């Protein structure tokens, strides 16, 4: 069941190759890739959530992703995976995707945004399925023999592997500040904003309304948004909120292993 996702939110992460040969910060990013099954299937973890709308309802045609300070919906039809030749997607849930695809040295994922803009992220990988038996073959025969092997099960039931969620840290955003006639204005736009200035008077505070600080220049101050109501997975790519973090909940990892024949 999807009930465990009601309080969560997506996040942004760093990507080492954003498609032009340069890095950027992307709404889609890759986590560790697992290759334990002897039949050559993959389990991939991403930062976006598939199958849940922004109103915490179930709809298998939609995905939701993070925009600037707010989630938004997008169509599932744009999801693609390839490793040289295109991959075949066999099932999805939440942060995880299963797919089968041929040999290669890279792995790429991407999707289409709500404004007709594409995003991709690429990581290196080495893919080479194992050999079963005393012969090497390329496809499934009609007349043959059966041997043991293992696979992944298409099941969403609860299992013993779990991951944890925590409170997000504060997020800086320089666009909240503007300079006019020797003064700097702060626009809150309905959010709780904390500010610091190095101008005369040592101004510190936490505000919910617009403020003007007189006799001060831009780039002598700092501002960030501090008040959050949702929980986030503690990815290694984001800073810790406090020296000793507090736990809010946990979710399970689908698709266990099982024994089959080949």
């Amino acid at each position: 069941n999807f009930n465990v996702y009601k309080a969560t939110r997506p996040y942004l992460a760093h990507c080492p190759d954003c498609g032009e040969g340069h890095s950027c910060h992307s709404p889609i990013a890759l986590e560790r890739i697992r290759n334990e099954a002897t039949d050559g299937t993959l389990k991939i973890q991403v930062s976006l959530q598939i199958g849940i709308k922004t109103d915490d309802s179930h709809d298998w045609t939609k995905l939701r992703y993070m925009d600037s300070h707010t989630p938004a919906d997008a169509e599932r039809a744009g999801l693609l995976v390839r490793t040289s030749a295109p991959c075949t997607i066999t099932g999805t849930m939440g942060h995880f995707i299963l797919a089968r695809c041929p040999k290669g040295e890279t792995l790429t994922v991407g999707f289409t945004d709500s404004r007709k803009i594409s995003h991709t992220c690429t990581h290196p990988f080495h893919h080479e399925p194992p050999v079963i038996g005393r012969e090497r073959f390329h496809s499934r025969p009609q007349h043959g023999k059966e041997l043991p092997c293992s696979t992944y099960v298409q099941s969403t039931a609860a299992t013993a592997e779990e991951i944890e969620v925590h409170m997000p840290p504060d997020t800086p955003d320089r666009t909240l500040m503007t300079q006019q006639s020797g003064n700097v204005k702060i626009t809150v736009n309905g959010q709780t904003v904390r500010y610091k200035c190095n101008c005369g008077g040592s101004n510190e505070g936490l505000t919910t309304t617009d403020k003007v600080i007189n006799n001060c220049k831009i780039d002598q101050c700092h501002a960030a948004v501090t008040n959050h109501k949702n929980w986030q997975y503690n990815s290694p790519l984001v800073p810790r909120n406090a020296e000793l973090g507090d736990r809010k909940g946990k979710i399970h990892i689908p698709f266990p292993l099982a024994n089959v024949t080949c």
Partner: antibody, heavy 119, light 106 residues
Framework: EEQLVESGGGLVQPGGSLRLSCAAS????????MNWVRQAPGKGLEWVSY????????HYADSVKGRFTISRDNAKNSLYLQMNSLRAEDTAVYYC?????????????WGQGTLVTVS | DIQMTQSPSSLSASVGDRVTITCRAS??????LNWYQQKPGKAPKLLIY???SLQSGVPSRFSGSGSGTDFTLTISSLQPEDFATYYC?????????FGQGTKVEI
């Protein structure tokens, strides 16, 4: 010169509605925030509502929630305050005021309000 | 949230006497306090917008200063035109609040 002109008062029966308008001259309307305040004989000063210059931030007093809504039009140079579900106790003079574009949250100008009676 | 009180509730003084009015708060205001003055029958009201600051158009007889929850305003000369009602306002948080009012009579 700066002016604030209040109009739209009168007597309304209980359960009705009344719209107040505040007109402005002498300054750039879109550059300043505005507030509404209330006063009545035997009573002191009270803040009612606030609207930011871009209509992005709105606050209401706890005693006036639901019955009151505030809006503005930066192209028509007009400020509105609308009261719905009027109750007999809501008899007072309502005023509009300007908020200054400087530090330490000054109020530089006040209007001259109109009497609203519910009875 | 932030409660304010001022004292005395009224003053009784003759022309030529000085006027002192103080305002107190239950919470820190960090100098975000202003003063108002008006006569009966009028909506407009205005005094100094900040501690140790003089508002444009205000005669030099009006002065005051501020401190932690303790604000003071004085008048150096009391003339027949100076008899009015005074208020304090704090603008540190939301909602904005006012004092109860002080009157000066001859």
């Amino acid at each position: 010169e700066e002016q604030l002109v209040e109009s739209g008062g009168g007597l309304v029966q209980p359960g009705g509605s009344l719209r107040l308008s505040c007109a402005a001259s002498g300054f750039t309307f879109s550059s300043y925030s505005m507030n509404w305040v209330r006063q009545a004989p035997g009573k002191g000063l009270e803040w009612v509502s606030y609207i930011s210059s871009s209509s992005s931030t709105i606050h209401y007093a706890d005693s006036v929630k639901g019955r009151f809504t505030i809006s503005r039009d930066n192209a028509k140079n007009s400020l509105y305050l609308q009261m719905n579900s009027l109750r007999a106790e809501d008899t007072a003079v309502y005023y509009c005021a300007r908020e200054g574009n400087s530090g330490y949250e000054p109020l530089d100008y006040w209007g001259q309000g109109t009497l609203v009676t519910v009875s | 949230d932030i409660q304010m009180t001022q004292s005395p509730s009224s003053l009784s003084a003759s022309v030529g006497d000085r006027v002192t009015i103080t305002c107190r708060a239950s919470q820190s205001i960090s100098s975000y306090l202003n003063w108002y003055q008006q006569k009966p029958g009028k909506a407009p009201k205005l005094l100094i917008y900040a501690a140790s600051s003089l508002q444009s158009g205000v005669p030099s007889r009006f002065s005051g200063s501020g401190s932690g929850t303790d604000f003071t305003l004085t008048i150096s000369s009391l003339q027949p035109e100076d008899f009015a009602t005074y208020y304090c306002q704090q603008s540190y948080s939301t909602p904005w609040t006012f004092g109860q009012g002080t009157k000066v009579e001859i």
